Amino acid sequence: RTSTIMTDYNPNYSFAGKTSSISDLKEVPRKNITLIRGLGGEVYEGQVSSPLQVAVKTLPEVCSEQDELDFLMEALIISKLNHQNIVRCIGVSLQSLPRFILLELMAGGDLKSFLRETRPRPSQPSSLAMLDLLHVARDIACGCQYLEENHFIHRDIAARNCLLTCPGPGRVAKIGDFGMARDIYRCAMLPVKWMPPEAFMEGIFTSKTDTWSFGVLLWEIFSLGYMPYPSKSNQEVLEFVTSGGRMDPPKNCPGPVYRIMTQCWQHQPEDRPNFAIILERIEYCTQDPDVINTALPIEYGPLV
């Protein structure tokens, strides 16, 4: 029932000058939670009792003490963030097994997969437009500004870690995964391709770290979901970036949008813009007819 490792360690978590613990999480009785279908531990669509529709993240019952504490810390982190562009935590069910974290259901799925699947193609020739991409960019930048204002460094701002509320028009993008920040609070897996020169060198992290990563996310968005640094390995990218190398513009990328990327990738953290300035630039692009009237490329495929 109640976790001995969570109860014994009882880690405190501080955010925005306030400290929380496992006792502050909203425990939802297990009887009120029904799993509906798998979505990809693992994640399920669920409902909590018109019941509330949720995403259910599960902790494997076969896991280490460290895995348990990691799951708790994730819960504490997301429960204390409060912004419309960050996925909500409805609550937790930590007193039954397997343990659950209950999250805002994001029916559009992750942003990387969405971009890859919704690329304009002969079957779907106006599936996305530049304004759709600028809206996603603005959405995540708003989330990032919130984190910056509250002195929280995300450390892995990447399309794979962003989610969409729905696939269709009106979609809102949100930051959904906080696993990297969770690991740091308490290598072949490091997100090398999203990291600025000072991070993988000296291990120095500031909010200008997330600015850099956001530049790479912008590239991911305007490329329609390509892996950054085409054809380069992690070590090749590390060497490339640390020597001043930067990605080229994505196919058909408007100049003003590419310029935001290259400002995000300034070598010195001090020369990179904060998120207020990034949002101002994104707004200017959004109001520029020559930007928003630029056609995205069509990826060749069949009509049906």
UniProtKB/Swiss-Prot annotation:
It is found in: Cell membrane. This is ALK tyrosine kinase receptor. Expressed in brain and CNS. Also expressed in the small intestine and testis, but not in normal lymphoid cells. The modification Phosphotyrosine is found at residues 9, 13, 44, 185. ATP binds at residues 57, 104-106, 177. Phosphorylated at tyrosine residues by autocatalysis, which activates kinase activity. In cells not stimulated by a ligand, receptor protein tyrosine phosphatase beta and zeta complex (PTPRB/PTPRZ1) dephosphorylates ALK at the sites in ALK that are undergoing autophosphorylation through autoactivation. N-glycosylated. Changing residue 152 to C: In NBLST3; somatic mutation. Neuronal receptor tyrosine kinase that is essentially and transiently expressed in specific regions of the central and peripheral nervous systems and plays an important role in the genesis and differentiation of the nervous system. Also acts as a key thinness protein involved in the resistance to weight gain: in hypothalamic neurons, controls energy expenditure acting as a negative regulator of white adipose tissue lipolysis and sympathetic tone to fine-tune energy homeostasis. Belongs to the protein kinase superfamily. Tyr protein kinase family. Insulin receptor subfamily. Residues 33-291 form the Protein kinase domain. The EGF-like region drives the cytokine specificity for ALKAL2. The heparin-binding region binds heparin glycosaminoglycan. Heparin-binding is required for ALKAL2-driven activation. The active site is at residue 156. It is linked to A chromosomal aberration involving ALK is found in a form of non-Hodgkin lymphoma. Translocation t(2;5)(p23;q35) with NPM1. The resulting chimeric NPM1-ALK protein homodimerize and the kinase becomes constitutively activated. The constitutively active fusion proteins are responsible for 5-10% of non-Hodgkin lymphomas. A chromosomal aberration involving ALK is associated with inflammatory myofibroblastic tumors (IMTs). Translocation t(2;11)(p23;p15) with CARS; translocation t(2;4)(p23;q21) with SEC31A. It comes from Homo sapiens (Human). Homodimer; homodimerizes following heparin- and ligand-binding. Interacts with CBL, IRS1, PIK3R1 and PLCG1. Interacts with FRS2 and SHC1. Interacts with PTN and MDK. Changing residue 182 to L: Observed in neuroblastoma.
